[PDB]
Point group: D2
Chain length 224, copies 4
């Protein structure tokens, strides 16, 4: 298996892209520590890591309501803060928590499950977009720093991928959705969650040691 | 004057790039409201705009200590939050406050004084870089939304530019600094604050109405 | 005037964006050498520069039919080569011819009139897009090299701008064009040629000495 | 079984640049690799290679030319400039244009272009080469979304600091100057092996990557980050 003998800490394992990651990574021989801890709590990240034991791979899987269609003037203080609390501050907490053991072993893997809203204008998702931009910045800044210790940090910039938070079954079923998707997505279809996990698998495996601090657009061509 | 008759609200007018903006913009006919209000306080932005009255241009000038050289493991919770509190959350507060009057008139200008740390890896500036990324994301997300109302929102991604916060006189006077800068900056010199204000002048003027949601790198070639 | 006392060599001055550059640059005090030489001929660029004498600014104004709608399979060898012959190879010839005098003086300005098709996928313009990418590459590669001699080379990545080659009056007049433009351009209008010349003015002036090897997207938000 | 089981892969200039490791890794993964050595600077050669090849599932567009490291803009004469485009730009469109009809007929296909991080950021002392690699990156950016409508993936590997003879031959990498420059500019602090490059190509050639469309993946140890 491509992750044989590896132990993978997956945050918010039932949220966002976690379910397909469990399936694919376990098929490939990984032991997946499927964590559900609320990492918006200061100190929670360090406790998760202490309890996990030996970690080879951190999958930083965070999601928050995009509030599709909410305008800049409707983006009130609470909606804005919730975006940062939910997917930005926990990212640094969990990465800072895992890095010491990575540095000790001069080896580690971090895959951040981000969004193409961190790459290009995404209509009607202002606060969410800026929070994903901050995550992208985290990978851009941490990646080259951690690479000195043979640690890979990379960012999957997904869009048009099936999940509960952004492309849930009721939303993607309408003719209106399908028409817009055909206009905007060159490949003309949504990604499956398994397809996302296969990219994550590459970035989590030792097949990708030379990829550092990169944002890989997983969007059917949307941001091209 | 290239800003003749225009009223310009400048945040944190004594910090970062504000002083040269005052000088250049007033030279060009603008009335510059030089604001010193602490916009980390909820409610402050709306109060500033109400007092300011008619605004043609918002200059979103925010800065925070980059903590040059501090690594990921030394980036504690407080340092991280301070970066977002100082330059990320206030940016939405002040833009959200100015947009309503722009939307009534279907005309507006916002110039965000950001950093090239929002574009590329900047050694030893992790939290600052991610917060500047969030600002770049704000311009990327808001720009196209606001452009439907004929409002320009753009981002200056500066680096290697003279200012108190990042390139202060004592720091830039050493031989070691100058040798590092010669290696990293193709132009081989720092920018003046006036040079920065001249780019901001272009983006604040009606000469730049077709520039929407862009990051212009102001870095002597560093990120090229 | 913002170009007072400057001499500007403008290639293909009766094509693409040249007319508005003549008008705006002359308004700002420049002597504009409006060149009409076929720079696809080896040797022509050096003869143009010999006849021009002292040049402060080179405006590299090149355009070729984009063949809107022609697909990859219909992009035949002649169409492909014509794109490179028309806008790629002449660009190096003319920049190579002007750089020596800039290097004697350790000062110079080059503005390359490119396209946002050098930045993002542009439906139905394959050969043209790749050739504009090559021009973008020329600015990216030459910019930092020339900056060591205090020479600025930058790239305007335009789209949705009025001109004979891409957005000519008959094409832009139709309801169908306007509805597509409203969907794809956040600003919801085309740029005027004068607006393009005002960005070029900034980049050709000594107000922009710190801008090195950059691509500035002039597209109403299209690529944002 | 192998991740390219049953697949037939046309690999251009198979002994040059990154071709040898592609053959090794792809064959280990069950691919049949058509290792081509045809000079694709000749008009008509691409379509002849493709007709000779038979059924193709994957095109690996592997092209290289001397970067002329250190040659300045003023020293980049007409021949040096033209040769960069002749060698890696014009052949890329010829060979992709030649393979796309069968991909379109089957509504399935894979193209991996072996490019360079010189298509992404300033690369000191490689001017003509950088612009030619930009043109290749433009080709993927422009073709990728067009070909995706036919369920064809086209992607670009933007490599730097990667084992190959064209850019990292022994004398170049042996100098103190090179090692100091690498340590300052390459976050991972080492060159990649060609096998590592082929493992990224393997992902992009496989059906594990169908949602990746027109992308430039930087393979450079973090250099361009
Ligand atoms: Cl998604
Ligand atoms: Cl700065
Ligand atoms: Cl145009
Ligand atoms: Cl390489």
């Amino acid at each position: 298996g491509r992750l044989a003998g590896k132990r993978v800490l997956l945050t918010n394992a039932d949220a966002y892209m976690g379910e397909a990651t469990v399936q694919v990574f376990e098929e490939e021989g990984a032991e997946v520590i499927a964590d559900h801890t609320d990492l918006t709590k200061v100190g929670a990240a360090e406790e998760v890591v202490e309890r996990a034991g030996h970690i080879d791979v951190l999958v930083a899987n965070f999601a928050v309501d995009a509030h599709w269609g909410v305008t800049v003037l409707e983006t009130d203080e609470e909606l804005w803060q919730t975006a940062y609390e939910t997917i930005v501050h926990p990212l640094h907490r969990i990465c800072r928590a895992v890095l010491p053991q990575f540095y000790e072993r001069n080896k580690g893997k971090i895959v951040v499950y981000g969004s193409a809203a961190a790459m290009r204008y995404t209509e009607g998702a202002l606060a969410y977009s800026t929070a994903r931009f901050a995550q992208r910045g985290y990978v851009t800044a941490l990646g080259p720093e951690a690479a000195r210790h043979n640690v890979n940090v990379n960012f999957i910039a997904q869009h048009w991928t099936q999940n509960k938070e952004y492309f849930w079954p009721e939303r993607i079923a309408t003719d209106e959705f399908k028409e817009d998707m055909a206009r905007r997505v060159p490949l003309g279809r949504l990604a499956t969650a398994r397809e996302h996990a296969l990219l994550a698998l590459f970035l989590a495996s030792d097949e990708s040691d030379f990829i550092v601090g990169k944002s890989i657009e997983f969007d059917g061509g949307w941001a091209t």
